[PDB]
Amino acid sequence: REVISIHIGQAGIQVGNACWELYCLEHGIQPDGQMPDAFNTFFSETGAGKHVPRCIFLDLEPTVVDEVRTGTYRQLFHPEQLISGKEDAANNFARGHYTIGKEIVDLALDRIRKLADNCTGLQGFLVFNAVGGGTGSGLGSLLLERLSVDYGKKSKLGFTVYPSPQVSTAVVEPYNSVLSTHSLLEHTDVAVMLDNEAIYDICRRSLDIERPTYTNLNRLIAQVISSLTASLRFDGALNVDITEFQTNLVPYPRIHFMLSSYAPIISAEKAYHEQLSVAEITNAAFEPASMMVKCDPRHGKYMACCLMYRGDVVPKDVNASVATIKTKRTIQFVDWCPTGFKCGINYQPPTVVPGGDLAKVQRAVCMISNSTAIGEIFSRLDHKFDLMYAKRAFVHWYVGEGMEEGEFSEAREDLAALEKDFEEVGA
Amino acid sequence: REVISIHIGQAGIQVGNACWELYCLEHGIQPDGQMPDAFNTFFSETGAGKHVPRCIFLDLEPTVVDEVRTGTYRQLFHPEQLISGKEDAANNFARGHYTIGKEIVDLALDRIRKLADNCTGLQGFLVFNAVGGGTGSGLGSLLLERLSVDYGKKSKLGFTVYPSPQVSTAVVEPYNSVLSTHSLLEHTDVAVMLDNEAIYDICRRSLDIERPTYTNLNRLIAQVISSLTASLRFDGALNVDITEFQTNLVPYPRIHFMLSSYAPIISAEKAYHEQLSVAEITNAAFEPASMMVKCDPRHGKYMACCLMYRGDVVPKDVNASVATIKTKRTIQFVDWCPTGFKCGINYQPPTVVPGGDLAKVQRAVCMISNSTAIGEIFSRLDHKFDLMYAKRAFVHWYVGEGMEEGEFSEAREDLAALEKDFEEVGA
Amino acid sequence: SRSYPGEQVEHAFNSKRLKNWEVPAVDKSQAISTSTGTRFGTLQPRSGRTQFIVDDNGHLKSGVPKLE
Amino acid sequence: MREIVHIQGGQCGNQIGAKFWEVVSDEHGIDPTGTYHGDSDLQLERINVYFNEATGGRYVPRAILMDLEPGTMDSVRSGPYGQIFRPDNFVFGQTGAGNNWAKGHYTEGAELIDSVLDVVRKEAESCDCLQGFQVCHSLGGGTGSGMGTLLISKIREEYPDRMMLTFSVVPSPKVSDTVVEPYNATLSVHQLVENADECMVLDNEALYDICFRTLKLTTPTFGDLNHLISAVMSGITCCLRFPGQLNADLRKLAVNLIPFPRLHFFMVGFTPLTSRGSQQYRALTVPELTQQMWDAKNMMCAADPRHGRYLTASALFRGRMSTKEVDEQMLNVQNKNSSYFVEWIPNNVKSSVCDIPPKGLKMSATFIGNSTAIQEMFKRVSEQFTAMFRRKAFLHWYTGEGMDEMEFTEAESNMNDLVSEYQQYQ
Amino acid sequence: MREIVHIQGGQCGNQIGAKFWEVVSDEHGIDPTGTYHGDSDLQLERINVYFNEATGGRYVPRAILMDLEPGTMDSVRSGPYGQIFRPDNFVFGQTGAGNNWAKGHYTEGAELIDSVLDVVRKEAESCDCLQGFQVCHSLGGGTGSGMGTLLISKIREEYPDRMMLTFSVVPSPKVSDTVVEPYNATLSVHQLVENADECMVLDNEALYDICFRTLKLTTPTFGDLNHLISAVMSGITCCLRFPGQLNADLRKLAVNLIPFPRLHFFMVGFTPLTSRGSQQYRALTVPELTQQMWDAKNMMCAADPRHGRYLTASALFRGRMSTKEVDEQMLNVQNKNSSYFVEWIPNNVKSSVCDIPPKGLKMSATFIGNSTAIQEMFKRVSEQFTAMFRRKAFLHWYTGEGMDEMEFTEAESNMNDLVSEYQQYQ
Amino acid sequence: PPIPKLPGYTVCLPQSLSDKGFKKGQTLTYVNGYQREDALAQV
Amino acid sequence: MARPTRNATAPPPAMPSIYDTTYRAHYIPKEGEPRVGPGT
Amino acid sequence: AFARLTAYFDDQLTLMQQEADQIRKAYNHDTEAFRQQQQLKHTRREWDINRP
């Protein structure tokens, strides 16, 4: 039951740095690489006394890859799994998609084929990238395209990091995000957005860290991924595999964009102050203040919802909470889906990392829901892509590295068509 | 049973030095020549406690032969076995084929006859040479002609080093290679190509040696030959002799050119990191970048494959790996053979040399296969021979030594006929 | 090359069971023309003797067609 | 003598079957190792209905575990009484359906049903006089409903005479585990109305209500729910497994319960169920058993019995009891509620008695009521099915696998006409 | 009294014979050094069939090991039970077959067949009442297929009335151990259909299927497959070596299994073959033996027997049993499968019983099924042969050694009309 | 009681390692002689 | 850094013997009905 | 009695298989130790040229 993860870009491999530390701590594997068979879905055991992860970090800037190579987990990672180039795409989708992508994707696919060949019960691939950059956008999209054409129907779970509405780090990220989502439409099976200002708000408000960095953000992302694969890793009252999200959250082949949320996210003092029960954690998982995406479903309609429960959870009270949520009309569902819920339960509570900020709890919930506030997000992004595209700014770059105006026009009109798609579906 | 090896040229006798060092290490024979009966296929036992290798190093420059004569293996080699001339061919196939070869071939043939009537169960001859030189090309071809007319039916394997596509240490090497192949066509029964640039790429990628010398190349060539001939010396579940390749690897009398690959060529760190079992070593054997000839099997179609397995190997997993290779769509065979595989298994794991680069492994695989990528290599060589022969460059050297343009024209037409043969046979 | 039905072992020779996990090679199994059309089927019986469509040393005759 | 083979499909089926086999093994007195250590010789005489003797008092169940994912089988095998299942009966895939009826009935079925059929054929030919098949599954999943349904169809095609029980756990509106629950359930019912012999409809909301109100438990886990279901199954087969005053086998129950061949969907309860403190405050009499057996807040489905008419009913009693009291109670209950029983069938109730109570209990009962109030559930599922299908939501996941829209239309037609016939007979 | 002369050809033949002789030595209680150490004198009674007394309880096998390279014989002699074989019986070749039917059948045979025939004649006329010859070899190799084939032809020409058994391992496309598999196999079977009396077809595909589905081993080296084949042939010949209630010798089996002279290709199976984890969960009864015997998963050929009709079948049982159970199981299995048995032959199954089971086993069985499904593997070899022969692939290695293409054409025609007559009789 | 020689009765050791070794002995050979040779089987 | 086990079985004290032919198992020396003298 | 004899044989085989597995683990540890002891990168005939 092995699932393999591929990290594309500087954000992707830092998220990988957090996730793999979490996995080693969960399965009791020392950073040197050996314990002092649940591990089998993430690590493969080589010979005697050594476990190597099933992942590849692929990137173009070598600085962070050599940081990984000379960090603490020097021996945990196989040397060939760490793919590094020599020069960046420099926030250029064209440069990372046509010039250097066509040189690096071949080796990336060559290593992924070996990982899949070693795999036995492959659940699917899952990708970690931020669409705002150049590498993870361009060659991330290229790698997804070729992986889809090579494997066809395997589940490709994309944990994408979209740019925040107001907080930004670049200027060409509208271009990059539009040109990446255009190709993400036809190839990604399940896609989950992750904004940065939402996680910043979560850390500032609930985890009361007044000066957070990317490390805390990656830690929360790793917590989410661990909660989402806990069903495969450990046995529970009602276990779930990765394949079920495709069938239970994607009513139409183009509508795969889901809002991730997690609860509780509490400090070591708020943990002492308040008790955590299934009813209140389910209620809090529906708040806009605990979402991983900066959007409000108050204006949207819940097309579907998936609830993952970890720890001291029984089915009766989760049924009761879901029933009360449905009976109350505070949130409303699309009338073409009265059966809009999917529950799953696992026994193991989430683990705590030394030096972390979360306190250990009895129970936790991860929501992956699908609504139309994502349709609001896409139009909001199209606004600021349109503004800069009106005067053809920064487009001379993309044309020089090898794109043309046809691709820009087709991507923008594809996003407009997706807007009309969402408008009609939400009716 | 006995098989004897003859080495012609600077490359031939150096790879012979490496191969004989490996043989002595394998059979536990001291450099003096005595142990502190599998040696019977390589070393003849004289008197009491003395083993003489069944080989001849023949060359024209005294320097490299005297290097062996004064090396650490003074007592191992019989003095008469080391044939040496007085003046070089100087990268001149014609000079080595008519002016010095006619003077050295009689003594070489006398020594070969003495070795042959000394041995009893002669399996065959195996020749080492590089076709780019003069001595290894001209008098080497002459000696193969005389061997064919003297014995004929006995197997004569060739492990020949063709000049690299772009990496070159000569200028008239296209002429030498074409004129050597024109005579090698109807005298060599099975020929295996060895390309220095392909071996350089293998060492750079897998053995992570940034600046290897010819010793590493010779060491891994010795590993390949030992792996493919170890079934005569060590008992195995499914053994195989030299005569098998003639029948099971050559579909037509003039199509005898074989691409060779070996796996695992893995350093000591990646060996500790990665598990080596039958499935992944079989996949690495068929992986195009691990071929020891600088070409691509994807551009062509497979004719037949031979898989030697050494060490801890059971039949079931090699059968399953063969089935997986068959069902994989990445590679395809010619439309003739539904059974294009020949497997062989030997118990003895490969040995290691002190100061070498290959880590000790439990199992190993050597693949020898046939395709039309050989035709692609021949076309590339023919183009750059044509470029030079169009303007009559360097022809005066051969004309002055004693050949004529008839040989050039007939060799060019023969190579064109070879190209047509590959094109029609692969249909 | 082609993969003939095994009639007892093809269940274990399924591509997914062999850890292939990509889209498998269907040409080798469709160029065989079984009775059923799938990999669980029986071959067609043959009769007579096969002529030499090729000339010597592997050169196709002029009359027989080929891909270019 | 008369033989029942067990077939468990999906995670729900596997867990329910694990609890069922624990219960039955304890009842026959075999240890978790698998050896016999019982006291009375009444336990030996009828173990062949479920078990097979291997070597010196070693009995293995006559069960077929079946799913598409290793996880549920590993969870079942790790726990106690997981060492008695024979590994050759673990027919077992590797990919996983994913709540897809098409995947579990057209793609993975075509490659797993050969081994499933081989195992079931071996296990059904090993015995001498097969009584019937007993299948346990849920109608919401893909590998439970699709795979088990295809197996049901093939088994009915092969052995068209023997009996067939289907313990099916249907969905209910309040908690809907999968978004494709009606798409799965409509097709499963389409196949069940023409292949299954009799079906026992279980419902998780009803089980939650029982464990909440009646048992007054705090954390009613799936272990407890599956134990209740296992008790129901054991009470069904008790008359076959033990001697009784008035014997009644599976075929007898089916013929006395089913008036017309398409009306074979029953609603089930179990007695006695008393709260952890109120156990001492109640009596153990046949009236005390029946006055809870006929209760609406005790049945294990989301169907109110007083919204319709009892077509037929069946009561299986266990314990040293009096037939006079049994018959008097049945007649009194039928007469008092004279408006909930169909007019053209006098004595709508079939009753039977067995003399071996469940372990630790003096007396017990089980109820199987074929009523016309289950068309409520059928209409409720049909409305959701039509609601999504009219607009073609979630349809590509079924269409792009081989299925057409004619399958959906014909399944809708069969469900609708079954609703109509239940209505006319009401 | 009746004498079986063993012949091993090629690498596979040599290894199979080594394992066979080890198994027979253990069964008869003769230690690897060659002295008798048995417990009951039932073993001493029939040791002349396989052994000759040399000097004070020194018994040597009546076997001839033959091939074109002493490489395999060196390992065979170096391994255990290596001193039992007489040094004179070995036959040597210095050139080697090189997987060439021509090299094994026309060039090296022409000079080594005189020696092998002298050895065979001496060994066969040393005894007084010969029963027949038993040759084990391959159909894909060079010195096992061709040279053994020419030995078969010579032996049939010299001693036409004595029995002949040929255990031949056939190739499969999936296990492509060599490239000229069709060229060797087609001509080998073309010679066998005209020379050999009866051929046992074996294949590594079915061997692996057995050792992973029934045995469930982890690393089944060639030793396990050779042990399987050795146990099979030992069960075949056990009737000659031990008294039984209903004896059946080689000629009796051949006449009861062969309806027409060209229909002498059988599929074989052995039972019981259970995993060590299931030996605790199963029993050992005649119905259990028969169920495993008739399962197609226990067959040892690349042809599902239920693709056609069983012409004849034979079951040799070992151990103390009841003939009533034996024949009732035979009748039941023949009547239940009315579509897999030919109509114009009543009582398709011939059964025999022997009272001496193999050491460590209470009861055992061996199956020989003359069915019409072997034409499937014949077709799968013939089509490969035609595909290669259409375009002269690898044909020069055969043409330049002496034979004509008329050989290939006639072999193709014989194999084609043979599969045609199988189809006619089906 | 010795373990019987049945198909399922064998331990699984690594094939690469053996105490005796994997040298192939030349116990069976030919004498060099002349165009007619003699087979020799040595103990 | 921060399973059921069973004891091995013993061979039976009464070792089974496979060398029991039907003839020798069913045909052993037997005696019965000594002759009775005639009456007077 | 026959069933018990078979059970005894199976248990003996399982014990010997456990011993063989221990031997396999020891063999893997031994070859890894040899690799780390003599096969390390800085012990080569080209380490002088390829030295960092």
Ligand SMILES: Nc1nc2c(ncn2[C@@H]2O[C@H](COP(=O)(O)OP(=O)(O)OP(=O)(O)O)[C@@H](O)[C@H]2O)c(=O)[nH]1
């Ligand atoms: N949530 C989160 N986002 C990150 C993190 N690191 C980088 N990012 C985002 O990544 C975007 C830019 O992409 P990078 O990952 O920095 O680099 P890149 O993807 O390789 O793109 P190039 O710089 O052109 O090579 C920025 O807008 C950041 O918001 C991180 O640790 N956590």
Ligand SMILES: Nc1nc2c(ncn2[C@@H]2O[C@H](COP(=O)(O)OP(=O)(O)OP(=O)(O)O)[C@@H](O)[C@H]2O)c(=O)[nH]1
């Ligand atoms: N792989 C490998 N190739 C070698 C080696 N030494 C020489 N060569 C090849 O041999 C070619 C030149 O011919 P040499 O063998 O060096 O000398 P020669 O064959 O005697 O020809 P002359 O110069 O006339 O003496 C070069 O292009 C090399 O590719 C070696 O040690 N290893």
Ligand SMILES: Nc1nc2c(ncn2[C@@H]2O[C@H](COP(=O)(O)OP(=O)(O)O)[C@@H](O)[C@H]2O)c(=O)[nH]1
């Ligand atoms: N009574 C009972 N119901 C269960 C159990 N496990 C799952 N279910 C029910 O089964 C439904 C979903 O089953 P599902 O996971 O789709 O089974 P699958 O076909 O194997 O995927 C849910 O509505 C649960 O209520 C169990 O152990 N006991």
Ligand SMILES: Nc1nc2c(ncn2[C@@H]2O[C@H](COP(=O)(O)OP(=O)(O)O)[C@@H](O)[C@H]2O)c(=O)[nH]1
């Ligand atoms: N079962 C089994 N088959 C074997 C063994 N050795 C070889 N074979 C089969 O024999 C075939 C090769 O025959 P080969 O040894 O080349 O025949 P030869 O050249 O005439 O000696 C392969 O397809 C193998 O499947 C063995 O030890 N056991």
Ligand SMILES: [Mg+2]
């Ligand atoms: Mg970057």
Ligand SMILES: [Mg+2]
């Ligand atoms: Mg030179």
